[PDB]
Amino acid sequence: GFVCNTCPEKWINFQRKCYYFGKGTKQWVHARYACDDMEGQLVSIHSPEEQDFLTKHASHTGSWIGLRNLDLKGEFIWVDGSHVDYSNWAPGEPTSRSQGEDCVMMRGSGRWNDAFCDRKLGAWVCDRLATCTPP
């Protein structure tokens, strides 16, 4: 169970995860289901090296990621339930005064903006666990 770097076709490995860079115009919840129906989830990001890997492959015109303010009251959490131990917010984000802007996108710089969930974006990123080579 020693080496975890195998992904399915069309996915890209980085560390112990596989990532799928989707293209196609979708609102946040729609991208959420595209990822689930391929057996991953909208991406969660947990380190600067993971962020750097995403920034190099990310779409220039913005991508949905798996961060959402779930519950009115300003606390953004990952769809996969993993915890928030890393953040790459654009300066000033997320703001208190933006009622309704509960979903998160990653810009071409890789920095994160909150967004209305019904915004349509051209790209979205899924992740899943890499499987491991038997030695």
UniProtKB/Swiss-Prot annotation:
Domain C-type lectin stretches: 6-128
Binding locations of Ca(2+): 93, 95, 113-114
Disulfide bonds: 4-132, 7-18, 35-126, 103-117
Protein name as catalogued: Low affinity immunoglobulin epsilon Fc receptor soluble form
Lineage, highest ranks first: Eukaryota, Metazoa, Chordata, Craniata, Vertebrata
Encoding gene, per UniProt annotation: FCER2
